[PDB]
Amino acid sequence: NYIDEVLNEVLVVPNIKESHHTTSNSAPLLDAAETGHTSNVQPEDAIETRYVITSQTRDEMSIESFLGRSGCVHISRIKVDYTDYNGQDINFTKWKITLQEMAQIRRKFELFTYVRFDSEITLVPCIAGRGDDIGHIVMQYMYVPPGAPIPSKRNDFSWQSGTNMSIFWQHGQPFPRFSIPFLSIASAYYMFYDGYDGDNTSSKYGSVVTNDMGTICSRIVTEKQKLSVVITTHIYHKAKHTKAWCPRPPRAVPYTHSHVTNYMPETGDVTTAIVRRNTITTA
Amino acid sequence: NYIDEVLNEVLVVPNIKESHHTTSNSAPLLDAAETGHTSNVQPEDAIETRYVITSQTRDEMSIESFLGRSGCVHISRIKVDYTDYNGQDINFTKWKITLQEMAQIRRKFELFTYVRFDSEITLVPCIAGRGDDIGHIVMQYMYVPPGAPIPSKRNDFSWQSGTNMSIFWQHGQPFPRFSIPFLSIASAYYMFYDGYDGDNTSSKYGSVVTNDMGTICSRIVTEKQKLSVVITTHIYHKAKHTKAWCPRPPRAVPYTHSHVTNYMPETGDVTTAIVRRNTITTA
Amino acid sequence: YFNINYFKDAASSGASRLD
Amino acid sequence: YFNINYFKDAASSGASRLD
Amino acid sequence: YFNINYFKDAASSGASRLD
Amino acid sequence: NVGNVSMYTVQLGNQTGMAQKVFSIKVDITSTPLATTLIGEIASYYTHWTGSLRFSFMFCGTANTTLKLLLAYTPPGIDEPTTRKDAMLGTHVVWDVGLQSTISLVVPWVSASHFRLTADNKYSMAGYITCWYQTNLVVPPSTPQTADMLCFVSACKDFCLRMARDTDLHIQSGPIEQ
Amino acid sequence: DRIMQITRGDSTISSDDVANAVVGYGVWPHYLTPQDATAINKPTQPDTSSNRFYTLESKHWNGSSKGWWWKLPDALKDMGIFGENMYYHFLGRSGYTVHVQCNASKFHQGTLLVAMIPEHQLASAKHGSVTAGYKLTHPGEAGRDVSQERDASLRQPSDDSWLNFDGTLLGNLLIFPHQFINLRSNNSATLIVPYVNAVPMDSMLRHNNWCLVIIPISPLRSETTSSNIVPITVSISPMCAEFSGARAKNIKQ
Amino acid sequence: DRIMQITRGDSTISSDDVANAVVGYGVWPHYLTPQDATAINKPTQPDTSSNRFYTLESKHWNGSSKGWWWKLPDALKDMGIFGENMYYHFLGRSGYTVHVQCNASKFHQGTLLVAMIPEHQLASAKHGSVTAGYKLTHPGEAGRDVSQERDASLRQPSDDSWLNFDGTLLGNLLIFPHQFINLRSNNSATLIVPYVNAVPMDSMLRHNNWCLVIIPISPLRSETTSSNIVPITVSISPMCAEFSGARAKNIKQ
Ligand SMILES: Cc1cc(CCCOc2c(Cl)cc(C3=NCCO3)cc2Cl)on1
Ligand SMILES: Cc1cc(CCCOc2c(Cl)cc(C3=NCCO3)cc2Cl)on1
């Protein structure tokens, strides 16, 4: 286990045996792909192979090393104000839970229909000094599940978190991180959906009727400062203890908007990664 | 234990067995609620149920995950002064122990008549820079039980704490936290009371005749600085190792004042969460 | 990892258990 | 060094294993 | 957790015991 | 009615017509009239709910009085029924008022998602429950002809909640003094 | 004890007062046996979703009321699932449970005779050899008579009660499975009835096996405000429904 | 041997030629287990009368044809019994068998790619955040596309094939359960598929779990009279249908 796990030799690939010639009836190279199945032909079948003892692990080819990597999924921003502190909808951020809200990683999952996981969340606040001294800028992140009082503005009553989670980070002390159970009323997170809100010819349809999990209302606790700032707290996300069901063809068209598939670009012709050739004859 | 405790499957709910029809005498659906007791009827009784093996824990429905969550119960503030340092009743805070001093969490307990617990106290000082440089602002929190010399002003003789508790926090070093035994001369904390100070038709009556536990006299040790500040040290509180006796109906009227039940708003009609319907016939 | 009451007093300890 | 789930909950733990 | 006199000297140790 | 007590009673009336309807409420346990209830008040402390539920009704009528109501649970899927027949088609319980007095109606758990959200959500719509006359309210001589029924809701051993969150049903648009 | 509880589908009915229950010909309704059978296909047997407690349209009990009937295979020609499976299949077979509710007070006086009847060939109101019409022996939830008025052009049955509509002194009707609803003791009437017919599975459309009759014997008498209406409500439950001979779908009429 | 025989209801289908059969995700469709379940009521399980071989509306295979899809929970919103039980119940769960027939002669040349797809969230043809409309992802036996014309006012999906309608290079579509119909060897295509969804029983109305696509890859090419029409016919069989959450009845749309 150790060795196998430390040496990373858990999932090893078979070796390529030796072959000889075959002047025989059954032709393995011939199958009818219309059966929708996949061929089973190998080196040893087609050629006069040798003998190679392999030693490549398919460890890094596991839904956990494919998925289990932290990725920017949101960049909370706060261009503070000292003029009006508090006021409605200010100096505090709120953002709806999700992804589809950002490619590269969105891309990645979408490779599967259903998915399930606990996550390694990490907050990377970066304090840009627009003043001659930033002081001590404390911070409060927290989670607002449904249906819950989402701060109208900066000091509601909801920042008491008498029964909510609020993580606090003060300049110097390291990046806040933490983790989380798999939050869904369903046995898995619906990375897609072919359902609607209802029969209302104006109902919602997508990944989304099924993902009302939150939002995040933010706060820079410290009170009024002299010299201004702007905070940019980056939100990274990692999938730990993941499972996946029914793979899908990757995405080749740059999306737009989340919780939707829509590609149809604003005017520009739909572009894809495929390159053009002069002729099939020369590559 | 582990698994059951790590998997959080300690308190599991029964499953819904299968039923068949009943053309029989005893009618479980009929009971007389006047007995003050509660009915005992189930799915299986009323319908022709199926068979569902459950898997929901009532773990998070425990007086410890209901109560055991940190909540703002006080926000100590100090608008420093450099003009007059010391002086009487300045630059040092003192506040009486309690709650009722702040909703959301006050609300929460009040759900029970009696309560008992040890607590996870955490101090979240936030230093607002009103100057061009905050220096090194050290801090001293401490606890003044009854009857004890409560600092008249900033440097008494009581800040020697020769036999008292004073926690010290210096800008950078993390949030001060600590904990505490259940402090009451009584076997439980009286979250209510129907008693008075005495027969004096001017005696006190409430939660409060029974809660003379303290106060907190504060201090910013550092001496005189140049560039001003304002400190806001937030006081969060968590209930660990809690017990509760005789549940009560929750509160629906926004209170006012603590250690009292009084709702009677200043003029405004007494408002409650109930919404109005046009008709009972349509919901 | 557990039951390592790093501190003496009992009032100081994690959230109790369940039973 | 391992299997020392310093934290109670299971959701908090390292990347799972392989089998 | 206890009796781990991380330091050599005896003068350095926790508050004694009771008996 | 609402700021008073009555706000709790439901008088069973005359009804010239027949097969007429009494009331309705929707099941989404965080929805006035439900919400405020010891349950509701609570559930509003968690993000998700589940299991069966129990509705109980009591006749504060008379002794010599008689009646027969039909109560029904209309699962999520359509609109709260306009008519009895339409509603009788799903889950229900005929209630014979008699020497007993309390009929308890169970609300099975019908849902796609093992779990439902406590917060208003078109998806997690639990449905409606309504009450209608089966027969009437007959009273022999010199007995009042309107009377009340009290209604209640307790949980089922089915029941369970999760994901604690801060409540809905209470905004401290204070502060709080001394 | 009189209280009774009955559970049939997703549906249950209660009665804090009753006059026993009756099983028609002392036989409990059940599914067809490969012995008495004849058909060759595998019958569809909707369980629960079909053989559940459907309640019909209610009616008024008058001092002028004369009587009202419902024909069973027919009363649920609309009752969801059962009543669809009826129309999609040639052969249908099923037994029922009849819950007849009719309350008023202990200060009321009235008597209802309830009875089920195998093959209730009604007679036409008009002399001749013209048999009652389809469309009129196929009323539906709504039932027939009341004491109603109608076209005599229609090959209309006998609205005539005392003759049993078939011309047999009502009162000998007690031979058919029955019970009364004496408002002074009773509250309901409960009939349960197996499948009776010289054939293993008949046409749910052409043939109505069971016919149910409710007849006011001693007229309703209160001293109250005629604001006090005392309905009569019928509830029914196909039991051990079985269908077969699947195909297109008939048509409503 | 290629010949195949399949029997599902009161219905059977034969095929004197075939390309095996395929079981979606190598799982055979069956009834829900009291472990993964959630609901509490006893599901109605129409056997045979419901999970039988329904055949849809046929279609033409053109040299101008572009492709056509049907959404399963939906394609039988009319197919008797199954499609009634759908409307009477909240929760519905079921697996299917897809028999795709398309013959012509050995002198014809053509290729059809057939595939089923779990949660086939289509994309709108119009840029924005406006999702396809209900009423248009709910075609019915008739299916959608063909290569048709329509209002652009409607929050209309992508009639766009090569992108998979979801914007995934068709051709990677081979990842979904599939097979082709190469007119030179094949005759049909047979897909069998269990119930896939993060929930034990979904809404048969709001949610279509399976989505089926048939796409002409190599264009039909004969040298015959265009009097010779080569249809494409789809036949389907709910399997292990199970329903529950009985009540009034939804409404057609
Ligand atoms: C799809 C999909 C993705 C997710 C994840 C939900 C978002 O997860 C977070 C939560 Cl619940 C809280 C916080 C957070 N709370 C305070 C700061 O950040 C961050 C993330 Cl990424 O759920 N369905
Ligand atoms: C009711 C009720 C609530 C309490 C708790 C008492 C307040 O607890 C504290 C104490 Cl004793 C000390 C400190 C403290 N000492 C230095 C800084 O904070 C904070 C709290 Cl919340 O007692 N009865």
Provide DSSP, H58-75: -EE--SS--EEEEEHHHH
Check CB contact under 8 Å for F140 and G58: no
Check CB contact under 8 Å for B241 and C9: no
Q: At which residue do the structure tokens 């009487």 appear?
A: B88
What three-state secondary structure class fits H82?
helix
Check CB contact under 8 Å for A182 and D11: yes
What would the two tokens of residue A148 be? 């819950």
What three-state secondary structure class fits H145?
strand
Strands (DSSP E) found in chain G: 4-7, 11-15, 22-23, 54-55, 59-60, 67-71, 89-101, 111-118, 144-146, 178-182, 188-193, 202-203, 210-218, 231-236, 239-246
Q: Which chain F residues are closer than 8 Å to G146 by Cβ?
A: none
> Which of G57, G24, G78 is closest to G192 using CA atoms?
G24
Pairing of strands F91-96, G11-15: parallel
What would the two tokens of residue B85 be? 């340092």
- Report the residue of chain B nearest G18, measured CA to CA: B25
Question: Measuring from atom 7 of ligand 1, which residue has the nearest CA?
Answer: A97
Contact partners for chain E, using 3 or more CB pairs closer than 8 A, are: C
What is the DSSP secondary structure assignment for residue A206, as one 8-state letter? S
Chains D and A touch (3+ CB pairs under 8 A): yes
- Report the residue of chain B nearest D10, measured CA to CA: B6
Measured CA to CA, the distance from residue F177 to residue F70 in angstroms comes to 50
Instruction: Report yes or no: G5 at the F interface, CB cutoff 8 Å.
Output: no
Contact yes or no for A140/A166 (Cβ under 8 A):
yes
Measured CA to CA, the distance from residue H199 to residue F123 in angstroms comes to 13
C8 min Cα distance to partner chain B (Å):
12
Q: b or e along H112-127 (b: 16 or more beta carbons within 10 Å of the residue's beta carbon)?
A: bbbbbbbbbbbbbbbb
Instruction: Out of A72, A73, A97, A98, give the residue to mutate to test ligand 1, the one with the largest number of ligand atoms within 8 Å of its CB.
Output: A97
Check CB contact under 8 Å for G222 and F140: yes
Q: From its phi and psi, is residue H246 left (phi > 0), alpha (psi between -120 and 50) or beta? A: beta
Q: From its phi and psi, is residue H164 left (phi > 0), alpha (psi between -120 and 50) or beta? A: left
Instruction: Name residues contacting ligand 2 (CB within 6 A).
Output: B 97-99, 121, 123, 141-143, 167, 189, 211, 213-214, 216, 235, 237
Using the mean position of ligand 2's atoms as its centre, give its distance from the Cα of residue B77 in Å: 17
Instruction: Report yes or no: H88 at the G interface, CB cutoff 8 Å.
Output: yes
Measured CA to CA, the distance from residue H115 to residue H138 in angstroms comes to 18
CB atoms within 10 A of CB H20: 15
What ligand is nearest to the CA atom of residue B166? 2
What is the DSSP secondary structure assignment for residue B44, as one 8-state letter? H
Interface test with B, best of A160, A179, A226 (most B CBs within 10 A): A160
Instruction: Identify the CATH assignment for F1-178 out of 2.60.40.420, 2.60.120.20, 3.40.630.30, 3.20.10.10.
Output: 2.60.120.20
Check CB contact under 8 Å for B283 and F51: no
Measured CA to CA, the distance from residue H155 to residue G160 in angstroms comes to 62
Contact yes or no for F95/F103 (Cβ under 8 A):
yes
Check CB contact under 8 Å for A168 and B175: yes
Using the mean position of ligand 1's atoms as its centre, give its distance from the Cα of residue A98 in Å: 7
Chains G and C touch (3+ CB pairs under 8 A): no
Which strand (E) or helix (H) includes residue B128? Answer: strand B112-129
Measured CA to CA, the distance from residue G12 to residue B27 in angstroms comes to 10
> Which of G104, G32, G95 is closest to G62 using CA atoms?
G104
Check CB contact under 8 Å for B52 and H42: no
Contact yes or no for G135/G251 (Cβ under 8 A):
no
Breaks (C-N over 2.5 A) in chain A follow: none
Measured CA to CA, the distance from residue B194 to residue B207 in angstroms comes to 8
Rg (CA), chain C: 9
Q: Which chain H residues are closer than 8 Å to B50 by Cβ?
A: 34, 37, 39-43, 244
CB atoms within 10 A of CB F140: 18
Question: Measuring from atom 4 of ligand 1, which residue has the nearest CA?
Answer: A98
Contact yes or no for H98/H212 (Cβ under 8 A):
yes
What would the two tokens of residue B68 be? 């055991």
Measured CA to CA, the distance from residue F91 to residue F87 in angstroms comes to 8
CB atoms within 10 A of CB B157: 9
Secondary-structure class of domain A1-283 per CATH: mainly beta
In order of A25, H100, H113, H184, H222, the CA distances from H104 in angstroms are 32, 13, 16, 9, 9
Go through chain E and tell me how many residues it has.
19
Name beta bridge partners: F104.
F56
What three-state secondary structure class fits B109?
helix
Measured CA to CA, the distance from residue F64 to residue F141 in angstroms comes to 9
Quote the Cα angle for H147-H151-H156, to 5°: 75
Breaks (C-N over 2.5 A) in chain B follow: none
For chain H, how many structural domains are there in total? Answer: 1
Q: Is the dihedral of CA F1, F6, F8, F14 positive or negative?
A: negative
Q: Which chain F residues are closer than 8 Å to G16 by Cβ?
A: 96-100
Name beta bridge partners: F49.
F116, F161
Instruction: Report the half-sphere exposure of H218 (CA within 13 A, side-chain side).
Output: 11
Check CB contact under 8 Å for F50 and B56: yes
Using the mean position of ligand 2's atoms as its centre, give its distance from the Cα of residue B123 in Å: 11
Q: From its phi and psi, is residue B91 left (phi > 0), alpha (psi between -120 and 50) or beta? A: left
Measured CA to CA, the distance from residue B174 to residue B166 in angstroms comes to 16
CB atoms within 10 A of CB A134: 18
CA H221 to chain centroid: 26
Which residues lie below 8 Å from residue H70, measured CB to CB, with a gap of 6+?
H56, H139, H141, H143, H144, H212, H234
Which strand (E) or helix (H) includes residue H179? Answer: strand H178-182
Measured CA to CA, the distance from residue F21 to residue B282 in angstroms comes to 10
CA B149 to chain centroid: 27
C14 min Cα distance to partner chain B (Å):
7
Chains B and C touch (3+ CB pairs under 8 A): yes
Name beta bridge partners: H190.
H99
Q: Which chain B residues are closer than 8 Å to H35 by Cβ?
A: 53
Look up the domain containing G36 and give its range. 1-253
Contact yes or no for A152/A253 (Cβ under 8 A):
no
In order of F63, F64, G186, H111, H168, the CA distances from G221 in angstroms are 20, 17, 16, 82, 78
Contact partners for chain F, using 3 or more CB pairs closer than 8 A, are: A, B, G, H
Contact yes or no for G40/G46 (Cβ under 8 A):
no
Residue in D12, D14, D18 nearest the CB of A59: D18
- Cβ of A97 less than 6 Å from ligand 1: yes
- Cβ of A189 less than 6 Å from ligand 1: yes
What three-state secondary structure class fits B117?
strand
- Report the residue of chain F nearest B49, measured CA to CA: F108
Q: Which chain A residues are closer than 8 Å to D9 by Cβ?
A: 181
Contact yes or no for B236/B176 (Cβ under 8 A):
no
Contact yes or no for A199/F125 (Cβ under 8 A):
no
Measured CA to CA, the distance from residue B213 to residue B207 in angstroms comes to 12
Measured CA to CA, the distance from residue F115 to residue B57 in angstroms comes to 13
What is the DSSP secondary structure assignment for residue B30, as one 8-state letter? B
Check CB contact under 8 Å for B53 and H37: yes
Roughly how many angstroms between the first and final C-alpha of chain D, as a whole number? 20
Technique employed here was: X-ray
Check CB contact under 8 Å for G5 and B19: no
CATH of the domain at H28: 2.60.120.20
- Cβ of A235 less than 6 Å from ligand 1: yes
What would the two tokens of residue G52 be? 């559940």
Q: At which residue do the structure tokens 């000998």 appear?
A: G172
What ligand is nearest to the CA atom of residue F165? 1
Give resolution in angstroms: 3.8
Which strand (E) or helix (H) includes residue H118? Answer: strand H111-118
Roughly how many angstroms between the first and final C-alpha of chain C, as a whole number? 20
What ligand is nearest to the CA atom of residue B188? 2
In order of H65, H105, H181, H227, the CA distances from H224 in angstroms are 18, 10, 20, 8
C2 min Cα distance to partner chain B (Å):
11
Contact yes or no for B134/B67 (Cβ under 8 A):
no
Q: At which residue do the structure tokens 């968690």 appear?
A: F46
> Which of H131, H144, H66, H153 is closest to A264 using CA atoms?
H131
Main-chain phi, psi angles of B96, to 5 degrees: -100, 125
Name beta bridge partners: G11.
F92
Measured CA to CA, the distance from residue H75 to residue H93 in angstroms comes to 15
Measured CA to CA, the distance from residue A75 to residue A237 in angstroms comes to 12
What is the DSSP secondary structure assignment for residue A33, as one 8-state letter? G
Contact yes or no for B149/B157 (Cβ under 8 A):
yes
Q: Please write down the HEC assignment for all residues of F25-94.
A: EECCCCCCCCCCCCCHHHHCCEEEEECCEEEEEEECCCCCCEEEEEEEEECECECCCCCHHHHHCCEEEE
In order of D5, F112, G1, G34, G241, the CA distances from H201 in angstroms are 36, 5, 42, 35, 25
What is the DSSP secondary structure assignment for residue H174, as one 8-state letter? G
> Which of H62, B33, G235, G114 is closest to F58 using CA atoms?
B33
Pairing of strands H12-15, H188-193: unpaired
Measured CA to CA, the distance from residue A133 to residue B132 in angstroms comes to 6
Check CB contact under 8 Å for G55 and F98: no
- Delimit the domains of chain B by residue range: 1-283
What would the two tokens of residue B152 be? 């008249």
Strands (DSSP E) found in chain A: 71-79, 112-129, 139-143, 166-169, 177-180, 189-190, 216-219, 229-237, 239-247
